[PDB]
Each structure stands twice: as structure tokens, then as C-alpha cells.
């Protein structure tokens, strides 16, 4: 049987901003995870449901690799029942999450001398996010009364903001690449296995 493209996700060279985190379904294939957990190349590997070693002997029905880039020190907010601007305005994990979070430092791949300002994130929003929902719009947030028509003048302002990802930044201030795997077990047979 086939092999799942975990290589084309974990070892893909262009992750998108956390405000527009990129979802990729994994299905109709069979691969392993106890090689990833064996790889030991990662710096944060937390499986919130089943333990990582046990899961290789399982089968899954709805696997979605979700990839984005955040700051090293804000990784704790990628967790159920969590506050933090990432988990508030950008990417909330459901409190009944059953999967794995995989964060590894990506300072060299991303942090340029002038910073990789392709990486943005939402810092303003009217309300938080229901889990696994995403906001992609880039309208100028109008907190005033008048329509400001894309002008970041008085009382209007951009909702997204950049990251100064440079090698001069601290360890926690260096960018981390984050992947999240969700293993739902619902009214369906399995398509992924070990």
C-alpha cells in the first residue's frame, strides 16, 4: 500500500503565516509516526490524546496536518484550553483535541538579516476563534465610526502584524515551525494506518 506524504508536509520548505495556517488532508495512504517520534530532530513533540509510541499501531479516519510558523516562546498557546494572542486571534485548539503538536526551531530556515516579513499574524479581532477555524481577510480593522477604506489613518489600523524574525533575536524570539496532526474517530472507517 501507499506511503503518506509526511515528507511533503514536515519537509516542505514554505510554511504560511499562522493567521492563514495551511491545512493538508492525509488520507487513502498508510505511513508511520514512530519514525517521526524516533527522528528526535524535533524540539517539542506532545501528543495530547494517545501516547506517541502506541499510536503507530492505530488507524485513523480524518488526519489533517496543519502547518504554520510562530515565535518560539509562544508555542505553549498551541494547546487546548489556552489563552494567548496566537490561541486567541489566530489558531485555537479544541478542548477535546486528540492529536499531536510538533514544533521545531527553524531559526536558520526563516530568520533573515532583514527578517522574513512574509510571516504575519492577527493581533486584532472582534472576538476569538472557535477551534480549528481560520480568518484570512485583511481588511483594515475599523474601530472608529467612519469607513476608512483601506487607509490606516486615525482610529483605523491593520489587523495583521509582522514578525522581526532575524538571527539576532533571542531563542524564544526566533521562529518555530509548527505542525499539528488531528486524529478524529467518528462515524467512518479508517483510511490511514501504520
Amino acid at each position: 500500500t501507499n506511503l503518506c506524504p509526511f515528507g511533503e508536509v514536515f519537509n516542505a520548505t514554505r510554511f504560511a503565516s499562522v493567521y492563514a495556517w495551511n491545512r493538508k488532508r492525509i488520507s487513502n495512504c498508510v505511513a508511520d509516526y514512530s519514525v517521526l517520534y524516533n527522528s528526535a530532530s524535533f524540539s517539542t513533540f506532545k501528543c495530547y490524546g494517545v501516547s506517541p509510541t502506541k499510536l503507530n499501531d492505530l488507524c485513523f479516519t480524518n488526519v489533517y496536518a496543519d502547518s504554520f510558523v510562530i515565535r518560539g516562546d509562544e508555542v505553549r498557546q498551541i494547546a487546548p484550553g489556552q489563552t494567548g494572542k496566537i490561541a486567541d486571534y489566530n489558531y485555537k485548539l479544541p478542548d477535546d483535541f486528540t492529536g499531536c503538536v510538533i514544533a521545531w526551531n527553524s531559526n536558520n530556515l526563516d530568520s533573515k538579516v532583514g527578517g522574513n516579513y512574509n510571516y504575519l499574524y492577527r493581533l486584532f479581532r472582534k472576538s476569538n476563534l472557535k477551534p480549528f477555524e481560520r480568518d484570512i481577510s485583511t481588511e483594515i480593522y475599523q474601530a472608529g465610526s467612519t469607513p476608512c477604506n483601506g487607509v490606516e489613518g486615525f482610529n483605523c489600523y491593520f489587523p495583521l502584524q509582522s514578525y522581526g524574525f532575524q538571527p539576532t533575536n533571542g531563542v524564544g524570539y526566533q521562529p518555530y515551525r509548527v505542525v499539528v496532526l488531528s486524529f478524529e474517530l467518528l462515524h467512518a472507517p479508517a483510511t490511514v494506518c501504520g
Partner: antibody
Amino acid sequence: QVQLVESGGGVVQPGRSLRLSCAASGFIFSSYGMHWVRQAPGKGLEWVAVIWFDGSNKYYADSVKGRFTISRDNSKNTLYLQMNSEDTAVYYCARETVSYGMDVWGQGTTVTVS
Amino acid sequence: NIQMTQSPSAMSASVGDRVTITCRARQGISNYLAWFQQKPGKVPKHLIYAASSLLSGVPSRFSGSGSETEFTLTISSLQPEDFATYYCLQHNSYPYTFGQGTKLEI
């Protein structure tokens, strides 16, 4: 060349009501935000109310019982009907921008409650 | 109702010098503070918004700065026309509120 043709200040009674309007000059009052501010002699500025174009309004700490705002976009006149009672103030009705940022105002309805 | 205050309720500072005026919020006003100027015979002229955005046209001798609990407005130089009453307006929470503060010369 923008301004507000303010309704002149009435001489009301303590406990009575009144109502003042401000016609627009130069700008398009149809899709701007109109603020009402009252400056009482013997005191300082005090923010009173804010009106959008799409019927969304917000009010002040003490002027949220006997005040009601409206924008007669047919006559382009931002108006309000208020109660009265400690309200003798020189009311300004400024209108908002994202660039200028409220750089045109009313001209002082000299309303007194006595 | 967030309330603000301005400690130097009046300052007698002469021409061609440098002064400051402080606003202090009894709650949290992240960055959206505005500095207004009013003179008798004139109309209030919104000088600064967002506590850092030096609005266009007005001179550069007006510089605001602060962070979410306290704010200042520095007048580095004084050509005499810049003597007036100075107010500050919070606009993070929508019930906007004002302060009190004036200027004087020796």
C-alpha cells in the same frame, strides 16, 4: 470648506427637555461619523455622544438617560433630542475622519437648564 | 467609564523652551490616546492620535509617547502661538473621555 450650522442654544427649565440640530456644510454627512461634545464654562470638555451613519450610536456616562441622537441624511443635519436638568455647556458637534481625525466641529449651542 | 487625569493642571513655562504634560488612566488604554489643543477664540484642534502618531501638518515640536497606563506629550520648543489648553482623549473603549490641563507663561 466644512462647518456645522448649529441650532442655537435654548433657555430651558430645570427638568424640561430640548432638541438641537447641526446642518452640514461642505462634507457629505451621509457616511461620516458625527460626535457630540459639550464644553461647560467653568469646566472642561466632556464627551457626550457618537453617531455612525448606519444607525449605530454610543453615549456618555451622564447623558445616557435623557439624550437621543439621529442623522437626518435627507437634510444632512446631525441632530438630537435631549432632556435637561448641571448641563449648561457649549456643545460641539464634530465629525470624524480617518485622515484628518475630527477636524471640523459644531459652533456651541449655548444650552442652559434654568 | 474609564477616567483620565492630567497632573500638571497648570504650568507657567516661558517661550522657547521644553515642557511636558502627563495623562494618567485609572484603567488600561493600550495605545489609542489623542492629544487635543484648544485656545479661547479658537476651535479644539486634534493634535495627536494613538499617543504616537504625530498627525500631519502640525509642527514636529509636539511628541506624544506612553504605554497603556501612562502617557506624556512633550513640547520640545515653544514659538508663542503654541500656548493653549491641552486635553487628552482615550478611545480604546468606546465611551470616550477627556482630561484637564492648561499652559501658562512666565
